[PDB]
Coordinates of C-alpha atoms and ligand atoms in Angstrom, one line a residue:
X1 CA 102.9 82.7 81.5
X2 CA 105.3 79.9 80.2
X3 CA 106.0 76.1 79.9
X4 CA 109.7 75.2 80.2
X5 CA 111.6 73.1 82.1
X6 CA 113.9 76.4 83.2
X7 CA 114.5 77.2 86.8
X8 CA 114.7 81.1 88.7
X9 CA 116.7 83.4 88.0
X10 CA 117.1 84.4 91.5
X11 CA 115.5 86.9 93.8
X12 CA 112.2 85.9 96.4
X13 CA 108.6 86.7 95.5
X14 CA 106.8 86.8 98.7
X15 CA 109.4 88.9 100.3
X16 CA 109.8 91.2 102.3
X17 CA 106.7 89.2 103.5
X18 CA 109.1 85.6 103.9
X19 CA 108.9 83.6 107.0
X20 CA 112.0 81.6 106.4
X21 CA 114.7 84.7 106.0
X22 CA 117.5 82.4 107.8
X23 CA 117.2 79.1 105.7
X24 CA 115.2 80.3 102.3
X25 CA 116.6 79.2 98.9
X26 CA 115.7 82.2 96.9
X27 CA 117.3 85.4 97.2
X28 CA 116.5 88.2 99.8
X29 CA 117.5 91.8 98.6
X30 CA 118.5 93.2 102.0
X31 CA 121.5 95.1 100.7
X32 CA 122.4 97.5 97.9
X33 CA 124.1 96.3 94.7
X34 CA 127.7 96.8 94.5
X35 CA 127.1 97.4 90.5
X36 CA 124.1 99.6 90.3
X37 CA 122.7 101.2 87.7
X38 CA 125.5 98.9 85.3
X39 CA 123.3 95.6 86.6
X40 CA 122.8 92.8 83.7
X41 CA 120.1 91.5 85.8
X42 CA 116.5 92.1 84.8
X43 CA 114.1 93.9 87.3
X44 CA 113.4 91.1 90.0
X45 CA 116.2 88.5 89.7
X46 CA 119.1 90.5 91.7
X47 CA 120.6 89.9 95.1
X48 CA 120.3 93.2 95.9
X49 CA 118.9 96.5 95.7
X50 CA 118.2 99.1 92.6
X51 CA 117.3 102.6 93.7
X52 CA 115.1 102.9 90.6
X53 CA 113.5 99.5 89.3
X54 CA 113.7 98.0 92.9
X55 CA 112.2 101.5 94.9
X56 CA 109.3 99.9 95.1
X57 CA 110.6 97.3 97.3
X58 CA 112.8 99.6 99.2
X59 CA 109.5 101.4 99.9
X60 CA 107.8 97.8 100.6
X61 CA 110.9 97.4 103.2
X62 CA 109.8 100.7 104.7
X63 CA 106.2 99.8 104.9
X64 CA 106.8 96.7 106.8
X65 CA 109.4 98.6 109.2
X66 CA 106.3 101.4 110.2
X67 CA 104.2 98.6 110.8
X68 CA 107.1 96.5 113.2
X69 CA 107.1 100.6 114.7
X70 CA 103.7 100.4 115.4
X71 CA 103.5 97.2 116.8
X72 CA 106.9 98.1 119.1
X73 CA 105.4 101.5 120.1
X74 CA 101.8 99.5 121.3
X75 CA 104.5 97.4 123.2
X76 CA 106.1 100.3 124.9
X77 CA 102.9 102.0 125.5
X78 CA 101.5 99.1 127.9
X79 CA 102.4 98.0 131.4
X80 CA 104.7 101.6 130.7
X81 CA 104.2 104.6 128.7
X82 CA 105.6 106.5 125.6
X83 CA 108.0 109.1 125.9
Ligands
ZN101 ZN1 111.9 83.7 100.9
ZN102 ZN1 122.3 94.2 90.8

């Protein structure tokens, strides 16, 4: 932990899990850096995306697209079927 008076550094900690991706203040890394792997940001304060530190997230990004799949082919697959 710490105790000083210092704001963020950027980046959002809930996402890709965020509700409020359309008027948030903290940053949603939706995008991948323009200055990759030469980034003086730390691991969780960029932007954008890090195929390396931030793969985890691009696989958390993934994870939640499957599950929007699923939910989309449940959607298709009532009152009409899959094809
Ligand atoms: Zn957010
Ligand atoms: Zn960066």
């Amino acid at each position: 932990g710490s105790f000083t008076p210092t704001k963020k550094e950027g980046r959002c900690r809930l996402f890709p899990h965020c509700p409020l991706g359309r008027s948030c203040p903290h940053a949603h890394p939706t995008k991948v850096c323009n200055e990759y792997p030469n980034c003086p940001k730390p691991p969780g304060t960029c932007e954008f995306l890090h195929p390396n530190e931030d793969e985890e997230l691009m696989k958390e990004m993934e994870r939640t697209r499957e599950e929007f799949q699923k939910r989309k082919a449940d959607l298709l697959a009532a009152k009409r079927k899959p094809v």
